Amino acid sequence: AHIVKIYDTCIGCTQCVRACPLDVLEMVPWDGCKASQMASAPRTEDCVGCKRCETACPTDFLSVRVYLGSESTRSMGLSY
Amino acid sequence: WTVPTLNPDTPSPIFGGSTGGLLRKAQTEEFYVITWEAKKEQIFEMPTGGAAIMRQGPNLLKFGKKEQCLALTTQLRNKFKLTPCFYRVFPDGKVQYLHPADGVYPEKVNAGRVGANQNMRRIGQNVNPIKVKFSGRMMSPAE
Amino acid sequence: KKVKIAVDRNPVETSFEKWAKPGHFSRTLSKGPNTTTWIWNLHADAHDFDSHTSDLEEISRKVFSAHFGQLGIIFIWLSGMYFHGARFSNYEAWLSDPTHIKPSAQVVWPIVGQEILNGDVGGGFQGIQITSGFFQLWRASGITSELQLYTTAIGGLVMAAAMFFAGWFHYHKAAPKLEWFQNVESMLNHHLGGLLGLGSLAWAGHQIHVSLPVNKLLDAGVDPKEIPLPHDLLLNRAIMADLYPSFAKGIAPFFTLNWSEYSDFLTFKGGLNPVTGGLWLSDTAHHHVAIAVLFLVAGHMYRTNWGIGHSMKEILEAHRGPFTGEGHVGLYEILTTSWHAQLAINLALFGSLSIIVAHHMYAMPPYPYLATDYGTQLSLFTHHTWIGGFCIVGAGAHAAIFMVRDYDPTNNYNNLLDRVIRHRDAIISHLNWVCIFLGFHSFGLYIHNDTMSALGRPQDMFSDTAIQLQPVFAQWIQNTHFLAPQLTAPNALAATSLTWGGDLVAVGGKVAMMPISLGTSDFMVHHIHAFTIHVTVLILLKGVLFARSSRLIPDKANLGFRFPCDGPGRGGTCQVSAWDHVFLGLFWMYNSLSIVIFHFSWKMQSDVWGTVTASGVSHITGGNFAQSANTINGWLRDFLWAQSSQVIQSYGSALSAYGLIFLGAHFVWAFSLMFLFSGRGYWQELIESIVWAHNKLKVAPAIQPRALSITQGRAVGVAHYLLGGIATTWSFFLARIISVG
Amino acid sequence: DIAGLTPCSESKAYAKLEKKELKTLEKRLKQYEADSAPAVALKATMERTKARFANYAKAGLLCGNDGLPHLIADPGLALKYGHAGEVFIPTFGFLYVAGYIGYVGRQYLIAVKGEAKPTDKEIIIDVPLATKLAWQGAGWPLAAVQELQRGTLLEKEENITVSPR
Amino acid sequence: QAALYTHHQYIAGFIMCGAFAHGAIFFIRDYDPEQNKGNVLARMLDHKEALISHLSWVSLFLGFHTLGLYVHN
Amino acid sequence: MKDFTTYLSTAPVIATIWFTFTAGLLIEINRYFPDPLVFSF
Amino acid sequence: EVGPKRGSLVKILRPESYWFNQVGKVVSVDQSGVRYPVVVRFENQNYAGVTTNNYALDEVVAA
Amino acid sequence: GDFLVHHAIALGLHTTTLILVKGALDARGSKLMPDKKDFGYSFPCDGPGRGGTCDISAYDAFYLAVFWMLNTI
Numbered sequence A: 001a002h003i004v005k006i007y008d009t010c011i012g013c014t015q016c017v018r019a020c021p022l023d024v025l026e027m028v029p030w031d032g033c034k035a036s037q038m039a040s041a042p043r044t045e046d047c048v049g050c051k052r053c054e055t056a057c058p059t060d061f062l063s064v065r066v067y068l069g070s071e072s073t074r075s076m077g078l079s080y
Numbered sequence B: 001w002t003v004p005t006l007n008p009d010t011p012s013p014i015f016g017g018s019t020g021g022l023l024r025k026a027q028t029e030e031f032y033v034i035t036w037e038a039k040k041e042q043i044f045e046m047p048t049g050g051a052a053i054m055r056q057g058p059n060l061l062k063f064g065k066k067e068q069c070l071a072l073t074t075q076l077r078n079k080f081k082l083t084p085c086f087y088r089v090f091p092d093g094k095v096q097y098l099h100p101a102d103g104v105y106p107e108k109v110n111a112g113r114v115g116a117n118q119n120m121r122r123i124g125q126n127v128n129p130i131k132v133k134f135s136g137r138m139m140s141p142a143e
Numbered sequence C: 001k002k003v004k005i006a007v008d009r010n011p012v013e014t015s016f017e018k019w020a021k022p023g024h025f026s027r028t029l030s031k032g033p034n035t036t037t038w039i040w041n042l043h044a045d046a047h048d049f050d051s052h053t054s055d056l057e058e059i060s061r062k063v064f065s066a067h068f069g070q071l072g073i074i075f076i077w078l079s080g081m082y083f084h085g086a087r088f089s090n091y092e093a094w095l096s097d098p099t100h101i102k103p104s105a106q107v108v109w110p111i112v113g114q115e116i117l118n119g120d121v122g123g124g125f126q127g128i129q130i131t132s133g134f135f136q137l138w139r140a141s142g143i144t145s146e147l148q149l150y151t152t153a154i155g156g157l158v159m160a161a162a163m164f165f166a167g168w169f170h171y172h173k174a175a176p177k178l179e180w181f182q183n184v185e186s187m188l189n190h191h192l193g194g195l196l197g198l199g200s201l202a203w204a205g206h207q208i209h210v211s212l213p214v215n216k217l218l219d220a221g222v223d224p225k226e227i228p229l230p231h232d233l234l235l236n237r238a239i240m241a242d243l244y245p246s247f248a249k250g251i252a253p254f255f256t257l258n259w260s261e262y263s264d265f266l267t268f269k270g271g272l273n274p275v276t277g278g279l280w281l282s283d284t285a286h287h288h289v290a291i292a293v294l295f296l297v298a299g300h301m302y303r304t305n306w307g308i309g310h311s312m313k314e315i316l317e318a319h320r321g322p323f324t325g326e327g328h329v330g331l332y333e334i335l336t337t338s339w340h341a342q343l344a345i346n347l348a349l350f351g352s353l354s355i356i357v358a359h360h361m362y363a364m365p366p367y368p369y370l371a372t373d374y375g376t377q378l379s380l381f382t383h384h385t386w387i388g389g390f391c392i393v394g395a396g397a398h399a400a401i402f403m404v405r406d407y408d409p410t411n412n413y414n415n416l417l418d419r420v421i422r423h424r425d426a427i428i429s430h431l432n433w434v435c436i437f438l439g440f441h442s443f444g445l446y447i448h449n450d451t452m453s454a455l456g457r458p459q460d461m462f463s464d465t466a467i468q469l470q471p472v473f474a475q476w477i478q479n480t481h482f483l484a485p486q487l488t489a490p491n492a493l494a495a496t497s498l499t500w501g502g503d504l505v506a507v508g509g510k511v512a513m514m515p516i517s518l519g520t521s522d523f524m525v526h527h528i529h530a531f532t533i534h535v536t537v538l539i540l541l542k543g544v545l546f547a548r549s550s551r552l553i554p555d556k557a558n559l560g561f562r563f564p565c566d567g568p569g570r571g572g573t574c575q576v577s578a579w580d581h582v583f584l585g586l587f588w589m590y591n592s593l594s595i596v597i598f599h600f601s602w603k604m605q606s607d608v609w610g611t612v613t614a615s616g617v618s619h620i621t622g623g624n625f626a627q628s629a630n631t632i633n634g635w636l637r638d639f640l641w642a643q644s645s646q647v648i649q650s651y652g653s654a655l656s657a658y659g660l661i662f663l664g665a666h667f668v669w670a671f672s673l674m675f676l677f678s679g680r681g682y683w684q685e686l687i688e689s690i691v692w693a694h695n696k697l698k699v700a701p702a703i704q705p706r707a708l709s710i711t712q713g714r715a716v717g718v719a720h721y722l723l724g725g726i727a728t729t730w731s732f733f734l735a736r737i738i739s740v741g
Numbered sequence D: 001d002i003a004g005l006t007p008c009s010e011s012k013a014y015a016k017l018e019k020k021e022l023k024t025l026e027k028r029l030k031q032y033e034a035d036s037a038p039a040v041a042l043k044a045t046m047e048r049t050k051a052r053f054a055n056y057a058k059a060g061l062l063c064g065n066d067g068l069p070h071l072i073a074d075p076g077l078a079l080k081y082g083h084a085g086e087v088f089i090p091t092f093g094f095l096y097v098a099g100y101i102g103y104v105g106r107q108y109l110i111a112v113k114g115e116a117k118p119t120d121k122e123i124i125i126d127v128p129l130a131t132k133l134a135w136q137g138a139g140w141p142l143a144a145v146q147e148l149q150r151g152t153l154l155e156k157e158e159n160i161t162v163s164p165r
Numbered sequence E: 001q002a003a004l005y006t007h008h009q010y011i012a013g014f015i016m017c018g019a020f021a022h023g024a025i026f027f028i029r030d031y032d033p034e035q036n037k038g039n040v041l042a043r044m045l046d047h048k049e050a051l052i053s054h055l056s057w058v059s060l061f062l063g064f065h066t067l068g069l070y071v072h073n
Numbered sequence F: 001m002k003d004f005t006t007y008l009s010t011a012p013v014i015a016t017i018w019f020t021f022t023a024g025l026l027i028e029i030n031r032y033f034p035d036p037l038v039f040s041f
Numbered sequence G: 001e002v003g004p005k006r007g008s009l010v011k012i013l014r015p016e017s018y019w020f021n022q023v024g025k026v027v028s029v030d031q032s033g034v035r036y037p038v039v040v041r042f043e044n045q046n047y048a049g050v051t052t053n054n055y056a057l058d059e060v061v062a063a
Numbered sequence H: 001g002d003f004l005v006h007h008a009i010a011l012g013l014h015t016t017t018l019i020l021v022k023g024a025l026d027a028r029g030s031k032l033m034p035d036k037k038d039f040g041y042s043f044p045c046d047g048p049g050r051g052g053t054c055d056i057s058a059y060d061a062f063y064l065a066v067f068w069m070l071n072t073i
């Protein structure tokens, strides 16, 4: 499983969730940096590590951060 | 909204057979099932390869990887404007619902889903790796 | 009526307003540059017309006028070669003595010591010995005067200006509609009747009336100054009826179908001209008459405006099998809707054709004194082989681009394309297995011979002596085409080539063409050829079939054709795109064709080319290919080290520039490895540490310095790799063969 | 006689090399006629060779055991024994031009910084401004040292550095 | 002599590359910026761009000019 | 022709013109002053 | 109100920012209790292609 | 010849140590990646984002320096 952490610089633009091809991220309301949305990563067991999320993050550098961790079948995109 | 139970009586799209389908991972570890209710018969694009014809009404489709199911999900949502929902099926018969885990799609708020893996600091306010040294496993300062 | 002219008047205004605004063709680059990557994207997307817009009509117009510009440039280049053969050549001296004088058409200015490059070629001339074979082509055309080259150059410049005027016209003044381009029936009918049918007919007319008499008199020892001019052979029928008495009969034998009377200038001789070492121009004239008839009847096949003919849609749609589903349906729409689907097929067949040309121009040398100019022959094989491989790689590229952009799954349901994409795993798996099988059983043979001869066990090698792998099928075909005039082609006086077997044709002491034997070494190298070809096919076809999706990345089509990677996820997804498969197929095309042209050079220098002074053919390398090329150390020693003696000792001589481009090409090739072995993220940080020094001195540019894209890094690396390797081989080949041949 | 080198005026391998090159060129010359283009070209090349060797031997160069001229990069050994125009004077002859190029580029950048779209004056050169600066930048050492003495040559630490500086 | 020289020189090159490699691993895994507050080792990281840019200049000049002289000859 | 002269002011055309001029200047220098190895004059 | 004016030039003091020690222009300052309220627009874009970013009141400074 | 090749040797040394020093100093952070210490010494990349981050680690700097070291020696 990779480590996806999301920081308080998230302005809540939903782009990281729309880019995620594995449904790892979701947008949670107001229980984060501020009100008006925030992101979260509850399903990191399905993260492959493609970093489309932080490719789409528009903040300075990346509010969403993928830290490549231990691999598995779900974290290596294996259909076998 | 409540968690939907997977209907096995749902038919499948008209596909002539490929080689990009299921492998021994389906029999051994897991596989995935995506469902959707269509309004017409439309030739869509399989993520495994080739084109299939969805049926008017409900459809069901097997996949060996979650990324395949979400690829078809975004294809059916963006090109056909449908609302699909997929699962995770285990070879012993256990079904685990996956995508709209709260009912609504994850880019939209739901007013009650809990924020996980949220570091409440700035990315430059992370500690140096000397402070997280000898924590057992090799650990990032983001923890 | 259906098939007709359909154009728009004055679609695009002719002004330099969009010349002053770079990046105008796209929505992203027209805003202006902020980083240097804009400067590269401006050039990478310049001719990517199908992303500037969506309407196929404007794309088609852009393509048409761009083709016109390419034709104008080709005409400029042709006129330049004719002009250099008119002003800066020893052509009129070479015609009198083509066996002694070296063809040269490039004079170097004496500025910084490069007057040493003006070699003593012959005919009281000093220049660079050309290897393009224009002198042989011109002699075969019947030129015999520099003035005719001069006026051909001026005609080429006129035609170039005409092509550029045509591009401007057919874009800005009167540009055709989409339904004009989509008349593929008419385009094929015309390109077969008039372009290739009437073109071959006209060239046959020239070959009847200008080439044949002029070259017949040139071969009879007549001086090119006292030969009748071609217009005198047109008007005065007495000269032609003296040279060919069937011209006394006029054109009546044609209209009376007493064609055998024409057997004086329309022959089926076969073999080579003993005095020039090339194909008989009467044979080529009859050839072009025949294929002109063939193409003119082939251009009356498709249905355009009168109900007779074929609809290509009807041929395609009615071709389907039980194994293949719906068959070729939707392919008419694919090819009348996608420019890239057309470009893929066209490039593939055009490059395979160029390699056909390379193989058929050395075994059947068409031009007088072409075979005995070993440099021209080697260069003409190598050049067209390389152009063919490049075109084939581009065919794979544009097939992938089709599959990414222009593919629509609604149009393609259980047709052949769908059925290929559905079992691409079987395709690529069997292709992988055969690539591995061939790699083992073709290269491990060379390794086995290296190990055996290094261990001192030459009786255990794979040779013509120890363990024979004889190419019996090719040997049988050689014997079948050598014995062809006796049984299976009774009206042929000889075989098509002397490479099948028989006697040699030697001209000027040098061997023009002689039988080519094949043994174990030839077996091994041919299987190496097939191996490398199959691996290149593996890469390019895997890029095509997996251009939309794979078991790794199912949404690769939305990612695009040209993207570096999806990420380090899934273990790492770099070079998953269909562009990077072309990037690797380029390397394997180079590795294939380098061996092809190496096989050519060594086999020719060992077993074909040479001199006959006494009783005996003395070849260049002495026939070592049979016994030396069983090993990699053989190709090292007796080819890459032995035949390199001419290029590294060329310093201080006329061929010194060849040694220079040897060393510089070795430089560029290795320079490519800075871009292929490395990655962007290092250079971006180096660049920003440099930008710090530029900021400190207030010289940081407004256009922010970025490292090259990942895709651009790979493209630069493959470009420098191919350039350096091919140019190293070019220098080595030419420096070797201009000296020893 | 700086590093054991013999002057090229009295070097024997130098003369042997001149004779060798002229012998090569006359070997090429003997196959041509009296007044033909190859003959005139080779005669001109022979004369260029003779003049080149004469001018190198006249300039006081030092030749090695191979007869080839060896340059003296050390100032002090070059200024003493008359070899300054080998590496030392062309050093400043280069540096003037190179700093001139760099200073014109710097001045152009600083000039276009103030405009509305500064990046478009870098892909599209403002040739009036560029030529004006290319002409008035011939005093680049004086203006450079005056920009240095005022402190306006170097940017302060408003430079974009990294997290660990 | 040849084997010994080439041997020890390649050994030296590999060892010297490993030296800087482990210096990097130090900067990552073992370096504490607060315990090295203001010392020479932090002063290196504070002017790292100057070091890298000047090393780049030396490399660039040497390559330009050595290759230029070699190609000229 | 303001736009045409803007085009000739672009980076590649100006570079072509300037390097053509520089190369021609160096070439004519090396013609009229052949083989300049040192600064003797 | 908090922060600088909505046209002021601002030097960024965030250490991990692309525009650290680099001048920017304020688009707006969100007057709520939001963390990182200052919206700064820059003439030069970062590696991602962005010219705007949200910064805090302690990460901004005049000129 | 000794002059020219000693300057080639200087080129190789300075460039090898340029790559190595750069990797060591930017081991902890760059403008393309200021959180590089949080990823360790040897990590593959930071994705195709931010223009491309291939061979951005310090490990990859050592890697690219081994080529220049082998050339130097």
Ligand code: CLA
Residues within 6 Å of the ligand: C112, C113, D097, E064, E065, E067, E068, E069, E071, E072, F026, F029, F030, F034, F035, F036, F037, F038
């Ligand atoms: C980078 C290393 C390097 C160095 C130091 C040199 C140095 C030299 N080379 Mg070599 N060369 C190199 C690389 C190098 N080259 C490479 C890589 C190649 C392969 C392409 C060559 C190929 C080569 C050849 C083939 C030749 C040389 C020649 C020369 C000499 C040229 C002298 C000259 O042009 O006088 C120029 C003298 C000047 C004073 C001009 C200086 C520049 C400006 C104009 C001065 C400013 C004056 C004024 C203010 C301008 C007016 C302004 C204007 C706008 C009006 C010199 C020894 C030539 C020679 O004979 O060598 C001995 C020669 O024939 N080189």
Ligand code: CLA
Residues within 6 Å of the ligand: C201, C202, C203, C204, C205, C206, C208, C209, C233, C234, C235, C236, C237, C240, C246, C247, C248, C249, C250, C251, C254, C262, C289
């Ligand atoms: C396209 C190919 C081509 C062309 C152009 C020619 C051309 C010619 N051939 Mg050749 N020929 C060819 C292919 C060709 N041939 C082939 C393939 C063969 C093998 C079968 C031959 C075999 C052959 C033989 C055996 C002979 C010729 C001959 C001739 C000449 C007589 C033409 C003739 O009688 O036909 C009749 C053609 C016409 C009546 C058309 C004339 C059209 C004119 C130009 C119309 C223009 C007028 C204009 C409207 C108004 C005036 C403008 C202004 C003044 C006011 C002519 C030069 C003969 C000859 O002279 O030998 C040297 C001859 O004996 N040919």
Ligand code: CLA
Residues within 6 Å of the ligand: C043, C044, C045, C046, C047, C048, C049, C343, C347, C390, C391, C392, C393, C394, C395, C397, C398, C401, C561, C562, C579, C582, C583, C719, C723
């Ligand atoms: C009939 C031939 C033909 C045609 C019309 C096209 C047309 C096209 N190709 Mg295809 N292609 C071809 C042959 C062809 N190609 C071949 C032979 C190959 C194999 C090399 C490819 C490989 C290929 C790839 C891999 C890609 C294309 C792409 C494209 C599109 C844009 C090209 C562009 O903007 O480049 C503009 C021109 C350049 C950038 C110049 C390239 C610089 C070259 C490499 C320099 C070296 C050449 C020189 C002779 C060597 C001497 C150098 C000297 C100057 C020092 C366009 C539709 C692209 C596309 O559609 O993707 C969206 C793309 O990604 N092509």
Ligand code: CLA
Residues within 6 Å of the ligand: C431, C432, C433, C435, C436, C437, C438, C439, C440, C443, C444, C447, C535, C538, C539, C584, C585, C587, C588
């Ligand atoms: C010399 C360099 C080299 C070698 C040996 C290979 C070898 C191979 N490449 Mg690679 N490749 C290379 C350079 C090389 N490549 C470069 C520079 C590029 C450019 C980027 C590529 C790009 C590339 C691509 C894109 C592809 C390959 C493929 C292949 C395979 C096809 C041949 C095969 O399987 O035959 C069998 C193996 C050989 C011929 C290798 C030599 C082994 C010999 C016979 C001895 C065997 C030893 C024996 C087992 C004893 C063992 C001793 C014990 C002590 C261990 C093979 C693994 C293709 C592939 O994997 O698909 C099939 C493929 O698609 N390569």
Ligand code: CLA
Residues within 6 Å of the ligand: E014, E015, E016, E017, E018, E019, E021, E022, E025, H041, H042, H059, H062
């Ligand atoms: C006293 C010397 C010394 C010591 C104690 C260490 C110790 C260490 N190094 Mg350092 N290192 C050294 C020298 C040293 N190294 C040198 C000389 C270099 C430059 C070459 C490096 C470069 C280096 C890097 C770049 C990295 C380390 C890492 C490490 C750590 C783990 C090593 C590892 O992964 O093991 C397992 C290592 C291997 C299995 C080595 C791979 C196999 C090698 C390349 C040999 C292959 C040769 C082949 C078999 C020959 C066949 C011949 C046949 C064909 C005939 C460990 C702390 C790593 C670390 O700390 O991670 C953060 C790390 O990333 N080191």
Ligand code: CLA
Residues within 6 Å of the ligand: C667, C668, C670, C671, C672, C673, C674, C675, C677, C678, C686, E056, E057, E059, E060, E061, E062, E063, E064, E067, H011, H015, H018, H019, H064, H065, H067, H068
């Ligand atoms: C022959 C191969 C080769 C060459 C020439 C270089 C050259 C260079 N590398 Mg190395 N490198 C290589 C292979 C090579 N590398 C390989 C295989 C790798 C492993 C991936 C690396 C890894 C590497 C790293 C990691 C680093 C370098 C760096 C450098 C630069 C060092 C500075 C220098 O010497 O400037 C002199 C430059 C040259 C000699 C090359 C330019 C050639 C001529 C002079 C340019 C002009 C030619 C001509 C006029 C233009 C024609 C073009 C057009 C008109 C057709 C330089 C560009 C360092 C760097 O960028 O720091 C500055 C650096 O950090 N390289």
Ligand SMILES: CC1=C(C/C=C(\C)CCC[C@H](C)CCC[C@H](C)CCCC(C)C)C(=O)c2ccccc2C1=O
Residues within 6 Å of the ligand: C674, C675, C676, C678, C679, C680, C683, C684, C706, C707, C708, C709, C710, C712, C713, C714, F015
């Ligand atoms: C060397 C290298 C670089 C660095 C190359 C730099 C960014 C660009 C090289 C030179 C540019 C083109 C500057 C040349 C000068 C400009 C064209 C402007 C002209 C100014 C005067 C010289 C006229 C990469 O960015 C890279 C990226 C991905 C894989 C491999 C590599 C790679 O090997």
Ligand code: SF4
Residues within 6 Å of the ligand: A004, A019, A020, A021, A022, A023, A024, A025, A046, A047, A048, A049, A050, A051, A052, A053, A054, A066, C569
């Ligand atoms: S790395 Fe890819 S799968 Fe993981 S969270 Fe980011 S976008 Fe989603």
Ligand code: SF4
Residues within 6 Å of the ligand: A006, A009, A010, A011, A012, A013, A014, A015, A016, A017, A038, A039, A053, A056, A057, A058, A059, A062, A063, A064
């Ligand atoms: S893309 Fe970045 S800023 Fe937008 S919601 Fe995701 S993490 Fe927050």
Ligand code: SF4
Residues within 6 Å of the ligand: C564, C565, C566, C567, C568, C572, C573, C574, C575, C679, C710, H044, H045, H046, H047, H048, H052, H053, H054, H055
């Ligand atoms: S190309 Fe670079 S960034 Fe992309 S996956 Fe490969 S290593 Fe990572």
